[PDB]
DNA sequence: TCAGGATGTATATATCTGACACGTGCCTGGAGACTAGGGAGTAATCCCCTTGGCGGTTAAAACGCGGGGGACAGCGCGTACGTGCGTTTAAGCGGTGCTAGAGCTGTCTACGACCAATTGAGCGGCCTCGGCACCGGGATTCTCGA
DNA sequence: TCGAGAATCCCGGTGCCGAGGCCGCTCAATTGGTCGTAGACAGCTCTAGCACCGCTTAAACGCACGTACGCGCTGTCCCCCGCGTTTTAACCGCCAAGGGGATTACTCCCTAGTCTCCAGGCACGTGTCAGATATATACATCCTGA
C-alpha cells in the first residue's frame, strides 16, 4: 500500500489533488469528476509552459536570466491569440511596448 | 356493413341545405328529369356523354346537393360547367348567383369560352395589378356580377368581398390542389362564412396517401362531415393477403362504391371518344457504371450506412455521378465538357442508342425531369452530340410557354427532344406533335400518368405513345418503383370506379371487374443490364422501321461503336471522400 | 499565518522549460493569479456550462467545452492535444 | 537646440521604452487619503495597496491618452482638446 | 497620531508629472485644458473604485482596508490586477 | 411541457401599480427575463461576496452588500428602505 | 395549524418560497439564509413596480392602454441611472429613440 | 418644371420614419442563408428554429444600429459628416474586437 | 457552361444598398461613403462567425444538432450581448 | 555635405539587495473500504425541421442620369504651450516613538438542514370579447421656391 | 423680406386574435418536530499603519521667448442624394417523405460520504551569489550653417 501522487501518473507539475478539493470546495457544482482535475492541471502545464517559455524568450532576448513584468507584457503583447484573450484584462507593471504611429514621426 | 345504417343517417342532416337554403330512393324522391339541352346554348352541341352528364348534374340538382366531376382532362369541362351555369339561369329562372374558381393558367380558356357558349352573361375577372383589380373591386359592389372569375392565390385577399356579400351556387376548378387539409384555402372556406350549393370538381382522382377522406369524404356533403371521422380507423385498413385485401374487403370495398354512386363522376375517353387507337408502355433496366458501382453504395457508407438520405446521397446521384459539384473536381479537375462525361452514368447511358436511332427514324421525343439540376447538365452534353431540341422550365415567367410551342410544333422544325418538368405545365400545354416520352426517374404520385401521359393520349396524336421507364439493379430507386407505382395502385379500384360509378352497365362491376382483381397475381411475379438488341426490336413500330435499324446496325455494328461503359480509374475510389466526409 | 499558492510547482516548470532562467517574487505571484484566475474562468464557466443540461456531476467534458469556449484561436487545438494526452496516460495506469 | 517636436519623440521612446514607475506616490497617497476622509474616517492603507490603485489608474489612463491620441489623429488635428477626450470617456460609458 | 491640513487637495497632481504620464500613452500634443478634465475623469472613476472598496470594508466588518477589496473591486469593474493577491 | 415564469405576480404587481394599465405576452417574458437576470447578478455576486470572507451561509447582509454593490446611484437607498422594511415587517410577525 | 403563506406576512406578490429553494438548488452557496429570500421578494417588488411604473407611464404618454417593448426601452433609456445599468446589456425589438446631431440638421 | 426635394430632406424624414417605428428592417431569408451558409463551415447539419434566427438578427441587428450611431457621433466630431472606412474601424478598435 | 453554381451573387452580399441603407438611416447617419458597404459586411461576418462558433460550441457540447435559441441567449448573454424576451 | 555640441554604451569594480537552496516541524492528500443516489442506454412518440420543386404577387433591389454641396488641399496669420533659466520646495528618507484593531483562538448556543405530514397556489386547457391593426379622405402641416 | 406644391395625423369606422379571466388539476409551497453545527461574542496578542522630525535634493513653478500649428478663409471638382426607370427574388401557399428534439421507466453503476492511516509542501532560519548604482570612454545620432 504505497503512496503515489497521482499527479506523478501523469507527469505532470500542478497537484490533481489540489486543485480538485479547490473545486469541490469552490462550490462551482455540487458534484466532481475523476479527471477533470487532471485536465486542469494537464491546461495548467500548457498555459504556465508556454507563457513562461515567452518569458524565457524574452528574457533572453533582452539579456536578463531572471524574468521581468515587463518582458511578461511584450511576451504576451507579442503573441496574436495570447493577447487576444488578454486584450481586455490589464496588467500590473507591466507597460506600453514602444510603438510609433505612421505619420507621427517627422521625415 | 356499417355504409348501411348510413341511409337512416342522411334524413336527419339532408334537409340543411334544402330547408335551411336506400341511398337512391332518398336521393330519388323528387322526380324532375330533363334531358334536352337548353334552348339558349350556342356555340355548339353535346355530345351523348355531355348530354347525359348534364342530366346527371340535374340528377344531383334533384335533391340540390353537391357533386364531383373526376373524368379526364379533354373532354371539354369547361363546356360541362358553362352547360349548368346557362341551364339553371333559364329553366328555374333564379338567374343567380353565380361564382367560379379556376387557376389562372387556365384561366384564359375560361375566360376565352364566355362569348361562345353564354354571350348573355356579365363577367367579372381579378388579374394584374391592384389598380385594375380594383375597377372591377368596385363595380360589383353596386349589385353588378353573374359569373365571376377568380383564382386560388386571391381568396384570401378577395376576403373583402366574400365576407360582407353572399352567395348561392359556387363552381371551383382543380380541386386536387384543394388536397391539403390544414391549407389556408380550405381553413378559408369556413371563414368564408357559407352559400346555397357547391359544386366541387377535381380533374384527377385521389392521388399519394390513403383515399381521400378530407374533402369529398367529409366537408362536401351534410352527412358527411362528422360520420366518417369516428369511422376514418376503419377504413382506412382495408385499402392476412387473401384473407383481408381479397376475400371480406372485397364487398367492403364495393360498399365504399356503393355509397359514392351518386357522388363521383368519373369517364375515360376510350370509352366515349375513343379517337386514340392505344398506348404502348415498355420499361428498361439498366445497370451501374464507374461512380454508379459499389462505389455508388460505398458513398452511403461515409454519409450514414448531411441528412435527407433519399435525397442527397440517392435520388441525386442515382441519375447523374457527380452532385453540388464540389466532387466533380475529383474526377474531372478541368470541369471542362469533353467525350464521354455523361456516359459514366448507369440511368444515362440508355440514351446513347436511342438519339442516334430516332434521329434517322423520324421521331420526336417527350422529356419529363425531376432534379432540376439534371435539367441544366443533360442540355450542356447534348451540345455535344449536336442534335436539335428546345428547353423550358418553371422560370419561364408564362411568356415563352405559349411562344415557344408554335416553334415546336413546326412540322419543318428538326428539333426532337423537349424540355419539361412534371409540375411545369399545369397539363394545359396542349402539344399533340410529339409521339415519344421518356422519362428518367419514377414519380410518386400517379400524376406521371395523369400529366405526361395526357400529353400524348390528348387528340391530335394518332400515332402509337411509347414511355421509356429507366431502372437501375440493385438500386433504392428500385423499392420506390413498386412504392410508387404498384403500391399506390390501387388507385386502380378507383379508375375502375368510374367505369361502373357511370351509367355502369350491370357486367361491368363484377365480370370485367375481377379482371382488374387478376392483376395482383403479376406483381409477385414480377418480385421475383439486359441488352441493347433487345430494346432494338421494341422500340421500332412498324417492319420497315425494323429493316432500317439493321441498316443502322451493320453501320455501327463494324467499329467498335472504348467501351459501352466506364468502370472505376482504381484510385478515385479512396481518394474522393476521405477529404469531405 | 496559514497561506497557499502554486510556487515550486511554477518553480519546476521553470526547471524544465529554461533551467538557466529565474523567476522573482513579483513574477511568481503575478503568475500565481494569473493561474487563478485563469481557472476561475474555467470552472466558473463549467458550472453554469453544466447547469444548462441540469447535470449535476461535472466530467471531463464539461471542462473540455469549458476551455476549448474559453480561449478562441488555435491555441485549443493544443490544449486538446496536452489535455486529452494526459487524460489517456492518466486513464492508460 | 533642436527641431520642435523631436525632443518629444525621443522623450515618448525613453518612457515607452522603460517599465518604471511615473506618477509620484506620495501625492498619490494623500490624494487618496484626503479623498477617502470624505466617506469614512480612518482608513487605513497598506503601501501594496497604493501601488495597485496607482498602477491601474495609471496605465489605464495611459490606455485614455492612447484613444484620446487616436481619435486625434482621426480627427486630422494633433493637438488634444477637452472634446476628444470627453468622447473618448463618453465612448468607454462611463458618464 | 497628530493632524496635518494642507491646501491644493485636488489638483495637487502636478503638470510635469501627469504631462510625462501622458507621454507614456504615446501623445503627442497636449493642450492646457487636458489637465483639468484628466482630473475630473480621474475623479469620477476614485469615487467608483473608492465606493467600491469602502463598500468591501464596510460588509467586513473591519476599519482596514485592504489591497484585497481593491483587487476585487477593480475584478467586478471589469480589469483585474494581478500579483497582489485574488 | 413543465415550465415556471413569474407571470401573473408581475400581472398583480400591475394591478396594484396601474390598474388600468395593460401588458403582452413578449412584455411579461422580457421582464421576466429581466427579474431573472437581475437575480441572477445579485445571487451570482453574493455567491463570490460571502466567499470572500469564508461564510459558509449566506444572509440578509450578504444580499445587502450585494445588490447595494451592483447598482450605483440613489436607487440603492430605496433599496435599503423598502427591502429593510419589509425585512423588519417579516421579523415583526 | 393554519397553512399562511410567508410571503403575505411581508404584504409583497413575489414569492418568498419559490426564489428559497430556487437559491438552495441553485449551488450559490453551500447553505442559505432565512431573511434573505424575503430581502429579494422586496427588491424584486420594488424594481418590477418601478420599471413597470415608468413603462406605464410611457404608455398613458403615447395613450395606449397596454404596453409595448418600445415603451419599454424608451422608460428604460429615458431614466438615467435605470438606462446607465442597463447601458451594457441589449433589448429585444426595443430599438432606438429619436435623436437628432446638433449640426447633423440645416438651417 | 418636376417636382423635387433639397438634398437631405428626404434624408430626414426617412431617419424619422425608421427611428419612429419598431419594426424589423433587415430581411429575413438573406440571413437565415447567411447563418446556414456561415454554420456550415463548422459543423454539419445545424438545425435552427426561427427563434433563434429573430434572437441573433435583432441582436446583431440592434448592436450594428449602435454601430453606425458611435460611427455618425465619430464622423460628427471630425467636422466631416461622410462615414469614411477609418472612424468605423476606429470605432470597432474603441469598442476592444480586434 | 451555366451549369456550374459557382457563377452567382455570393452569399456575404444578401444584405443589399437599400437594406443596410435604411438600417444606416435607422442608426443616425446621413451621407455614407462606399466602403462602408464592403466594410461594414465585413465586421458582420467575422462577429457573427464567433457567434456562430460559440453556438456551435455550446450545441455541440449538448450532443444535439438542434441550436436552440436559449442557446443563443447563453452565448450572447457570456458575452454580455444578453438579449430578453426569450430566456 | 561636416564642425560643434546633446543622448547612449561596455569595460573594471565594488557594493547594497533580493533569489536561490539546504535543511527542520507540521497540516495534509491519497489509498484501501464500504454504502448511496445521479445518470445512461436502452424504446416508444408526437410535433416541428430539413431536402429536393411548383405557382404566383408585389414592394423592394438594381441601374442610369441630373446636380448640390462638402472633402480637400492650399494659404494667411494670431496665438500658446514647447523649450530653456532661474528659484523655491515640497517629495522623499531614514530614524523616533505611539497605538486601534487584524487576526487568532476559545466557548456557548440560535439557527438552518431534514424528514414526515398537509394542502391551497399556481400551472395547463377553454372562452369571449374589447383594445389594436388597417383602409379611406380630408384638414391641416411642412417644404420650396418664385 | 412671403405665397405655391407634397406629407402626415385625425378621425371614422370596421376585422381580429391574443389578454384576461375562468376552471380543473396536482404538487411544489407550508407546517411541525428533530438535530447537528457554523457563528457570534470574548479574550488575547502584537503589528504594521500613523504621526513627528531633522535632513537632503531632484522636481515643480514662475518667467522669458519663440517658431509650429490650428483656426479661419478660400477655391476646385467629384461623389452621393435624389429623381426616374427596369426587374426581381423574398413572401407566401402548397407536394411529399424522412428524420431530429422531449417523456416515462428501469435497472445497473461511479464517485460523494466516511473512516483509518501516512508522507509532502510550506512556513522558517540560512549564507551565497545575480543584479543595480556609481564612472570613464570611442562611438551613435539630431541641429545649424554652407
Redesign the interface.
Known amino acids: 500500500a504505497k503512496a503515489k501522487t497521482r499527479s506523478s501518473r501523469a507527469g505532470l507539475q500542478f497537484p490533481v489533488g489540489r486543485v480538485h478539493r479547490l473545486l469541490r470546495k469552490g462550490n462551482y457544482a455540487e458534484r466532481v469528476g475523476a479527471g477533470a482535475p487532471v485536465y486542469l492541471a494537464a491546461v495548467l502545464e500548457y498555459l504556465t509552459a508556454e507563457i513562461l517559455e515567452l518569458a524565457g524568450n524574452a528574457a533572453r532576448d533582452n539579456k536578463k536570466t531572471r524574468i521581468i513584468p515587463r518582458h511578461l507584457q511584450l511576451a504576451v503583447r507579442n503573441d496574436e491569440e495570447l493577447n487576444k484573450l488578454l486584450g481586455r484584462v490589464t496588467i500590473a507593471q507591466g507597460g506600453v511596448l514602444p510603438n510609433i504611429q505612421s505619420v507621427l514621426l517627422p521625415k | 356493413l356499417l355504409d348501411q345504417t348510413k341511409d337512416t343517417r342522411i334524413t336527419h342532416l339532408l334537409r340543411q341545405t334544402n330547408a335551411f337554403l336506400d341511398y337512391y330512393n332518398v336521393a330519388h324522391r323528387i322526380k324532375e328529369d330533363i334531358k334536352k339541352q337548353p334552348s339558349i346554348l350556342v356555340g355548339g352541341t353535346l355530345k351523348d356523354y355531355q348530354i347525359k352528364g348534364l342530366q346527371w348534374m340535374v340528377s344531383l340538382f334533384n335533391n340540390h346537393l353537391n357533386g364531383i366531376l373526376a373524368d379526364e382532362m379533354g373532354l371539354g369541362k369547361t363546356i360541362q360547367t358553362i352547360s349548368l351555369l346557362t341551364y339553371l339561369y333559364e329553366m328555374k329562372n333564379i338567374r343567380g348567383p353565380y361564382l367560379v374558381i379556376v387557376p389562372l393558367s387556365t384561366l384564359s380558356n375560361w375566360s376565352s369560352e364566355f362569348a361562345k357558349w353564354a354571350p348573355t352573361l356579365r363577367t367579372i375577372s381579378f388579374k394584374g395589378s391592384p389598380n385594375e383589380r380594383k375597377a372591377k373591386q368596385a363595380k360589383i359592389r353596386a349589385g353588378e356580377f353573374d359569373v365571376v372569375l377568380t383564382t386560388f392565390e386571391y381568396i384570401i385577399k378577395e376576403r373583402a368581398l366574400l365576407s360582407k356579400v353572399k352567395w348561392v351556387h359556387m363552381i371551383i376548378d382543380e380541386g386536387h390542389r384543394m388536397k391539403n387539409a390544414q391549407s389556408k384555402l380550405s381553413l378559408t372556406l369556413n371563414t368564408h362564412y357559407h352559400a346555397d350549393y357547391r359544386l366541387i370538381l377535381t380533374g384527377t382522382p385521389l392521388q399519394n396517401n390513403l383515399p381521400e377522406l378530407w374533402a369529398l369524404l367529409n366537408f362536401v356533403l351534410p352527412k358527411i362531415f362528422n360520420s366518417v371521422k369516428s369511422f376514418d380507423e376503419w377504413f382506412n385498413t382495408p385499402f392476412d393477403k387473401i384473407e383481408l385485401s381479397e376475400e371480406e374487403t372485397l364487398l367492403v370495398i364495393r360498399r365504399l362504391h356503393k355509397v359514392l354512386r351518386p357522388f363521383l363522376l368519373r369517364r375515360l375517353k376510350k370509352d366515349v371518344e375513343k379517337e386514340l387507337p392505344d398506348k404502348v408502355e415498355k420499361v428498361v433496366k439498366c445497370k451501374m457504371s464507374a461512380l454508379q458501382q459499389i462505389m455508388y453504395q460505398q458513398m452511403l457508407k461515409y454519409r450514414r450506412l448531411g441528412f435527407n438520405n433519399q435525397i442527397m446521397q440517392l435520388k441525386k446521384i442515382c441519375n447523374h455521378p457527380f452532385v453540388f459539384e464540389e466532387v466533380e473536381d475529383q474526377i474531372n479537375p478541368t470541369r471542362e465538357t469533353n467525350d464521354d462525361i455523361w456516359r459514366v452514368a448507369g440511368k444515362f447511358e440508355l440514351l446513347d442508342r436511342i438519339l442516334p436511332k430516332l434521329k434517322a427514324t423520324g421521331h420526336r421525343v417527350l422529356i419529363f425531369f425531376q432534379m432540376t439540376q439534371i435539367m441544366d447538365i443533360m442540355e450542356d452534353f447534348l451540345r455535344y452530340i449536336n442534335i436539335k431540341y428546345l428547353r423550358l422550365d418553371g422560370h419561364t415567367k408564362s411568356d415563352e410557354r405559349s411562344e415557344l410551342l408554335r416553334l415546336f410544333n413546326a412540322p419543318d422544325s428538326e428539333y426532337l427532344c423537349f424540355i419539361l418538368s412534371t409540375r411545369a405545365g399545369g397539363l394545359g400545354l396542349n402539344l399533340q406533335t410529339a409521339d415519344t416520352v421518356i422519362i428518367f426517374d419514377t414519380d410518386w404520385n400517379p400524376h406521371q400518368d395523369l400529366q405526361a401521359q395526357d400529353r400524348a393520349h390528348r387528340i391530335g396524336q394518332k400515332n402509337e405513345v411509347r414511355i421509356l421507364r429507366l431502372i437501375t439493379t440493385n438500386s433504392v430507386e428500385e423499392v420506390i418503383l413498386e412504392r410508387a407505382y404498384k403500391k399506390l395502385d390501387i388507385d386502380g379500384k378507383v379508375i375502375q370506379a368510374g367505369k361502373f360509378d357511370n351509367k355502369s352497365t350491370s357486367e361491368e362491376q363484377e365480370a370485367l371487374l375481377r379482371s382488374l382483381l387478376d392483376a395482383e397475381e403479376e406483381r409477385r411475379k414480377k418480385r421475383e443490364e439486359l441488352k441493347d438488341s433487345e430494346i432494338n426490336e421494341i422500340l421500332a413500330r412498324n417492319d420497315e422501321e425494323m429493316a432500317v435499324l439493321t441498316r443502322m446496325d451493320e453501320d455501327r455494328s463494324k467499329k467498335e461503336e472504348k467501351s459501352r461503359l466506364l468502370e472505376k480509374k482504381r484510385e478515385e475510389s479512396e481518394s474522393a471522400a476521405v477529404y469531405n466526409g | 499565518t496559514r497561506k497557499?499558492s502554486?510556487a515550486i510547482?511554477?518553480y519546476?516548470?521553470?526547471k524544465?522549460?529554461?533551467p538557466?532562467?529565474?523567476?522573482?517574487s513579483?513574477?511568481m505571484?503575478?503568475?500565481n493569479?494569473?493561474?487563478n484566475?485563469?481557472?476561475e474562468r474555467?470552472?466558473?464557466?463549467?458550472?453554469?456550462?453544466?447547469?444548462?443540461?441540469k447535470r449535476?456531476?461535472?466530467?471531463?467534458?464539461?471542462?473540455?467545452?469549458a476551455?476549448?469556449?474559453?480561449?478562441?484561436?488555435?491555441?485549443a487545438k493544443?490544449?486538446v492535444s496536452?489535455?486529452?494526452?494526459?487524460?489517456t496516460?492518466?486513464?492508460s495506469? | 537646440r533642436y527641431r520642435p517636436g523631436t525632443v518629444a519623440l525621443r522623450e515618448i521612446r525613453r518612457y515607452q521604452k522603460s517599465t518604471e514607475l511615473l506618477i509620484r506616490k506620495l501625492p498619490f497617497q494623500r490624494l487618496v487619503r484626503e479623498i477617502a476622509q470624505d466617506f469614512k474616517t480612518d482608513l487605513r492603507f497598506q503601501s501594496s495597496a497604493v501601488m495597485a490603485l496607482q498602477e491601474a489608474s495609471e496605465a489605464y489612463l495611459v490606455a485614455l491618452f492612447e484613444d484620446t491620441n487616436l481619435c486625434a489623429i482621426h480627427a486630422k488635428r494633433v493637438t488634444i482638446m477637452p472634446k476628444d477626450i470627453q468622447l473618448a470617456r463618453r465612448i468607454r460609458g462611463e458618464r | 497620531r497628530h493632524r496635518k491640513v494642507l491646501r491644493d487637495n485636488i489638483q495637487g497632481i502636478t503638470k510635469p508629472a501627469i504631462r510625462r504620464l501622458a507621454r507614456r500613452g504615446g501623445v503627442k500634443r497636449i493642450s492646457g485644458l487636458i489637465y483639468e478634465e484628466t482630473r475630473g475623469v480621474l475623479k469620477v472613476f476614485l469615487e467608483n473604485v473608492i465606493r467600491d472598496a469602502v463598500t468591501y470594508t464596510e460588509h467586513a466588518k473591519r476599519k482596514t482596508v485592504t489591497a484585497m477589496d481593491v483587487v476585487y473591486a477593480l475584478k467586478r469593474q471589469g480589469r483585474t490586477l494581478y500579483g497582489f493577491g485574488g
Chains 1, 7 share one sequence.
Open positions: 497557499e502554486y510547482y511554477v519546476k516548470v521553470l524544465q522549460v529554461h538557466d532562467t529565474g523567476i522573482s513579483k513574477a505571484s503575478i503568475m493569479s494569473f493561474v484566475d485563469v481557472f474555467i470552472a466558473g464557466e463549467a458550472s453554469r456550462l453544466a447547469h444548462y443540461n449535476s456531476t461535472i466530467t471531463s467534458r464539461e471542462i473540455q467545452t476551455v476549448r469556449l474559453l480561449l478562441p484561436g488555435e491555441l493544443h490544449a496536452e489535455g486529452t494526452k494526459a487524460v496516460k492518466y486513464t495506469a
